[PDB]
Nucleic acid binder design. Structure first.
Ligand SMILES: Nc1nc2c(ncn2[C@@H]2O[C@H](COP(=O)(O)OP(=O)(O)OP(=O)(O)O)[C@@H](O)[C@H]2O)c(=O)[nH]1
Ligand SMILES: [Mg+2]
Lengths: 949, 167
RNA sequence: GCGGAUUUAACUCAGUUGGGAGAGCGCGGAGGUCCUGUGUUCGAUCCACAGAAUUCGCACCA
């Protein structure tokens, strides 16, 4: 069997083989774990060095390890012991562990698992004996081996990261206490001597490993063993040795984070006299990142120690706050470090410090002393916020660099926002002068190299007043005087900024104009340039690729929010050059053959759709007589309709004709998406002429679903524009769309329907009746299908969502009667269960599905006619009392609601008797239903957690 | 210049899909759990030359991963993949790492959160801290939209070649 | 180190699983960006995602 395994493994390791050979092999080796006898074969191989391949021994070692995992101590103490003596005899020899790395590493792993099942009692001498051997055979290679076993034991008992089982944890805590109560003093003593020894020998490899063990274990061992005078001295020393400097700062940290009583850290923290190290801490960024992390570590501690109200001695508060203000210089030095890895290693300290700082300013005003600190903190934060004035901007939207930068800006902002909290006037002024300052300096530079400074200026500006959107952001609620926001914004709008070429600058400008458009609500005379700006060759007609598309959206948002008047006509004229559609078929990642989807997904058509919408907002909020407005209306709908007729009449199969039709329908749909709902408006006629055109194209291309979405969409916009003037043809629409229905559009369909069910409520009733039968069985069929992949499960959840919401709408808008029109009689029973099934799945499915299940009870509250509402109502019981056996409150909260509504019995006679009968709990439930909406919920949640516990 | 890259992750995280996408360009919407290991010689181009990657697509299913850690032997790099849609596939990311290093002392490991195309996310962005605690390169990626699909290979290639300038 | 709650006018509390939101109190009327930002939709206070403020546990250090 040995030579077989050796082959199996060899087989599996060669992918130059037939699958037939791998099958047998792969299953043979895996058989080893499954088999009761399998492992005996690996037991013989792992030790064999003269006759076996490392490759084989590995798979045997690994096997053996997994096998050691599942053997219960008491029931297999014989085999576990058996495999130990074997590993130990092996480990003792010391002559094969200098094989390849995997063979030594995997050995360590088995030993540690063994250890984990026998140490507390069965393996008393584990540390004495192992250490005695490592010391006996005096060589680093061996010490290292030992050192790694210690790290491995920690990996299995100190790593918070792995699965956190309540048992494994109780089982883990035992090994900890065992190690603590038996050989900890010597494990550390052993390690120490090694650090000391290999340290003098200049053997940095092993000293490193030692320093790790100390880092790892400090988290959970007698700190005293680690913070004695002789060991510390050895550390501080390592702090000045290139080779050991870092490991030392990493372990230094761990000593500092070792959790304990506030008065306890203070000493430790004090005793480490780490400030001198800080005083000195040259260009090695890795190190600086280590020191930073250490400072940050010490910083976060002291701030937490200074916030505990436990021990009130100011002695503690004095030395603690004294040591903290002492760390401030450092905190700034590194927060400002050009290297971004370094500065971030202190955010947490900054984070907490500031919090503590505004907790202290809530009581009294900050000290002149601190006001400077914050000021100096902003000075740093501002430095990190700017683009590097050396490396030119990347036009790459995938540059990991730009993505990492944006992340730091996202944080650097909350620091500014917190500082603001501590002193909004300090922040305000300081920022105004920073933005003003930055813009001033920008003017003194060649355009080519001034952008960074401007981008920063418009950035801060863009954010300065995020969320502050009341007229109080602009003007003082009492003096009515301008706000630093009003002043910053003013400066910018008046600054040349708008004439700068750089993308980031132009975009950010328009973004600022959109976001704070309400600002201009006061200064109305300044609107023309903002509108002419977007319009001009910098804003909407930009020659930059990213800006041009993105520009059209902002202009739409700008115009949408800036409606009053006098910019109507010119805006419409300037948009012209941009309204003709030219989508070309293109090849893709998912489309060897150009698809309407691929062609369009690569165009700027979606973005352009905002112009059409804009042009419609300009025409409804503009000073244009009914004649002039209706003129532009019908001048555009006839040109689009026209592009559809020419496309329709030619070969309907062509992607070019299809594309053409789709866009023509989309543009008209978005054109109407800007006009106000249905007084007699000028546009009406012109939009009703377009409604007829959908059918024309729906008749010939109704086959293709893309056109169908475009139809369900556009007609809904026009209906929300025309309203009742289309109602008579609504059913002809519904009908066509139904047969070409697919599975992909079961959701675009449902919303199109409720979209209408909303516009005309009572009117859509009869239509829904004749249609519910179709929509139901489709939904029923695609939801019953267990998913075969992610996308499937995704497509299902969405459906699940809209399906429920549909039925909730039906009921909430007054449609229940339709479910009963004979067209849907055979469908009532399953519909209810459908919903009842979505509730027992696992929350979005249970909170909204359980809710629908409830309204269904209130609407059908009497056995009168409903022959399956009792057993269904009654069938909901097991749900209300058994589900939560195996977010959860909304789940249980609404589970009770169902109980309550039903409640306004069969449970006493019938239910309790089936389930194990709890006399005490059975009457407390009826008391809750009978005598307690609010009160019953409480009983119910506490009740079940109890029933469940 | 061929390098062994073992791809490991929990079951259903998209390892195979990721592979197919780069080998054929096709995106497989159906889930067919890999068994044992499938191995394809994905290759690439670079300013300095052609780097080949022998990808060992491993199975992350407890059921079909015979020779689970065996496959990591003599591996020269690796990708540890998790599903952003499935929470636990992250909670286990440590293990995959722990295992990988147990065999391969020190290799360039790339941690990848897959399926970022699906909006909702079970593995929220605030929990993804493993790469920053284990000095590992990370990448939010998607086998469906090809989002960052080449980051993982580029990075590794740039390390295995010690040439940061590599593309 | 994990894991949950909370955040609606001056006040004080209601309330919907997205159709524009209110009773008491407080100057025939008046008064809220339903914590913020971003996204998904024809449209969100009520969805998704990102974050802030307030806060309650559990685990480790013990
Ligand atoms: N939306 C989306 N789905 C993905 C992506 N990657 C994978 N999937 C889905 O996950 C499924 C593929 O999972 P697999 O790659 O076959 O999982 P696997 O790699 O075989 O798992 P193993 O066999 O253990 O390696 C497909 O059906 C996809 O729908 C992605 O990037 N985006
Ligand atoms: Mg696979």
């Amino acid at each position: 069997s040995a030579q077989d395994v050796e082959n199996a493994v060899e087989a599996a390791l060669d992918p130059s083989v037939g699958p037939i050979i791998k099958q047998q092999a792969t299953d043979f080796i895996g058989s080893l774990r499954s088999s009761s006898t399998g492992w005996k074969i690996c037991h013989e191989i792992f030790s064999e060095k003269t006759k076996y391949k490392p490759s084989t021994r590995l798979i045997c070692l690994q096997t053996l390890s997994e096998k050691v995992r599942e053997w219960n101590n008491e029931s297999n103490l014989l085999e576990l012991q058996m495999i130990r003596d074997s590993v130990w005899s092996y480990i003792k020899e010391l002559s094969f562990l200098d094989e390849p790395a995997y063979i030594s590493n995997a050995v360590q792993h088995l030993l540690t698992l063994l250890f984990l099942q026998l140490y507390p009692s069965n393996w008393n001498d584990f540390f004495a004996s192992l250490q005695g051997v490592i010391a006996a055979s005096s060589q680093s290679e061996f010490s290292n081996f030992y050192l790694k076993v210690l790290l491995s034991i920690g990996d299995e008992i100190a790593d918070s990261l792995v699965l956190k089982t309540d048992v494994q944890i109780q089982k883990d805590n035992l090994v900890k206490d065992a190690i603590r109560a038996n050989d900890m003093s010597d494990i550390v003593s052993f390690v120490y001597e090694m650090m000391l020894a290999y340290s003098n020998a200049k053997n940095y490899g092993t000293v490193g490993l030692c320093l790790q063990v100390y880092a790892q274990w400090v988290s959970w061992i007698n700190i005293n063993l680690i913070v004695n005078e002789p060991c510390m001295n050895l550390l501080y020393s390592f702090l000045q040795i290139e080779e050991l400097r870092c490991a030392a700062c990493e372990t230094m940290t761990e000593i500092v984070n070792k959790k304990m009583k506030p008065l306890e850290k203070l000493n430790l923290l004090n005793i480490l006299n780490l400030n001198l190290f800080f005083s000195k801490s040259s260009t090695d960024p890795n190190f600086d990142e280590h020191v930073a992390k250490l400072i940050n570590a010490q910083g976060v501690e002291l701030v937490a120690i200074k916030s505990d109200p436990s021990e009130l001695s100011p002695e503690l508060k004095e030395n603690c706050s004294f040591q903290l203000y002492n760390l401030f210089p450092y905190l700034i030095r590194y927060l400002s470090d050009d290297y971004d890895e370094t500065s971030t290693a202190v955010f947490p300290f900054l984070s907490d410090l500031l919090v503590s700082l505004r907790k202290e300013s809530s009581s009294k005003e900050l000290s002149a002393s601190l006001k400077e600190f914050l000021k100096s903190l902003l000075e740093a934060i501002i430095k990190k916020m700017k683009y590097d004035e050396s490396q030119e901007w990347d036009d790459d939207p995938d540059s990991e660099e730009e993505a990492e930068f944006q992340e730091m800006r996202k944080k650097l902002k909350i620091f500014q926002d917190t500082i603001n909290s501590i002193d909004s006037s300090l922040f305000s002024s300081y920022m105004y002068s920073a933005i003003t300052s930055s813009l001033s300096t920008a003017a003194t530079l060649s355009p080519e190299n001034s952008w960074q400074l401007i981008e920063f200026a418009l950035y801060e500006t863009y954010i300065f007043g995020e969320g502050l959107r009341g007229p109080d952001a602009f003007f003082n609620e009492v003096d009515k005087s301008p706000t630093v926001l009003s002043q910053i914004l003013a400066l910018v709008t008046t600054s040349q900024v708008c004439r700068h070429p750089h993308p980031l600058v132009q975009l950010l400008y328009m973004e600022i104009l959109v976001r704070y458009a309400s600002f201009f609500d006061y200064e109305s005379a300044a609107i023309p340039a903002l509108i002419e700006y977007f319009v001009g060759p910098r804003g909407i007609h930009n020659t930059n690729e990213r800006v041009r598309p993105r520009a059209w959206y902002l202009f739409y948002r700008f115009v949408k929010s800036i409606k009053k008047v006098n910019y109507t006509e010119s805006s419409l004229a300037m948009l012209g050059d941009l309204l003709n559609i030219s989508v070309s078929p293109v090849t893709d990642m998912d489309a060897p053959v150009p698809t309407l989807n691929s062609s369009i997904r690569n165009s700027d058509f979606n973005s352009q759709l905002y112009l059409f919408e804009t042009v419609g907002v300009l025409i409804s909020s503009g000073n244009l007589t009914p004649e002039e407005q209706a003129l532009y209306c019908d001048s555009l709908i006839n040109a689009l309709i026209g592009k559809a007729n020419a496309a329709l009449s030619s070969d309907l199969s062509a992607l070019e004709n299809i594309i053409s039709v789709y866009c023509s329908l989309m543009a008209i749909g978005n054109f109407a998406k800007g006009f106000p709902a249905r007084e007699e408006v000028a546009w009406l006629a012109s939009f009703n002429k377009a409604s007829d055109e959908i059918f024309l194209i729906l008749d010939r291309m109704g086959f293709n679903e893309d056109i169908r979405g475009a139809v369900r969409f556009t007609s809904g916009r026009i209906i929300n524009v025309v309203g009742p003037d289309m109602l008579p043809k609504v059913p002809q629409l519904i009908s066509i769309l139904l047969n070409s229905i697919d599975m992909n559009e079961l959701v675009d369909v449902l919303s199109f329907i409720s979209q209408l069910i909303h516009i005309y409520k009572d009117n859509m009733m009869e239509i829904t009746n004749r249609m519910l039968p179709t929509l139901l069985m489709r939904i029923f069929s695609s939801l019953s299908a267990a998913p075969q992949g992610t996308d499937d499960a995704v497509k299902q959840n969405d459906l699940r969502k809209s399906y429920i919401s549909f039925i909730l709408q039906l009921l909430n808008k007054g449609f229940g009667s339709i479910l009963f029109t004979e067209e849907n009689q055979v469908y009532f029973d399953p519909l209810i269960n459908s919903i009842l099934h979505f509730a027992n799945l696992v929350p979005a499915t249970q909170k909204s599905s359980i809710a629908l299940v409830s309204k269904m009870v209130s609407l059908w509250g009497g056995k009168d006619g409903i022959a399956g509402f009792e057993n269904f109502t009654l069938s909901l019981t097991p749900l209300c009392f058994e589900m939560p056996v195996n977010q959860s409150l909304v789940v249980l909260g609404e589970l009770a609601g169902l109980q309550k509504i039903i409640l306004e019995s069969y449970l006493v006679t019938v239910y309790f008797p089936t389930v194990n009968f709890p006399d005490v709990m059975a009457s407390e439930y009826l008391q809750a239903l009978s005598n307690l909406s609010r009160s019953f919920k409480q009983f119910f949640q506490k009740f079940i957690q109890a029933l469940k516990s | 210049p061929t390098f062994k890259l073992v791809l490991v992750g929990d079951g259903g995280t998209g390892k195979t899909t990721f592979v197919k996408r780069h080998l054929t360009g096709e995106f497989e919407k159906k889930y067919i759990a890999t068994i044992g290991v499938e191995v394809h010689p994905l290759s690439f181009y670079t300013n300095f030359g052609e780097i080949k990657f022998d990808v060992w697509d491993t199975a992350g299913l407890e059921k079909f991963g015979g020779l689970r850690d065996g496959y990591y032997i003599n591996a020269q790099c690796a990708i540890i993949m998790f599903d952003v849609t499935s929470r636990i596939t992250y909670k286990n990311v440590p293990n995959w790492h722990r295992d990988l290093v147990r065999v391969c002392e020190n290799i360039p490991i790339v941690l990848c959160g897959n399926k970022v195309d699906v909006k909702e996310r079970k593995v929220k962005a605030k929990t993804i801290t493993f790469h920053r605690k284990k000095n590992l390169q990370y990448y939010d990626i998607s086998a469906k939209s090809n989002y960052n699909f080449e980051k993982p290979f580029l990075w590794l290639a740039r390390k295995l070649a010690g040439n940061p300038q590599l593309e």
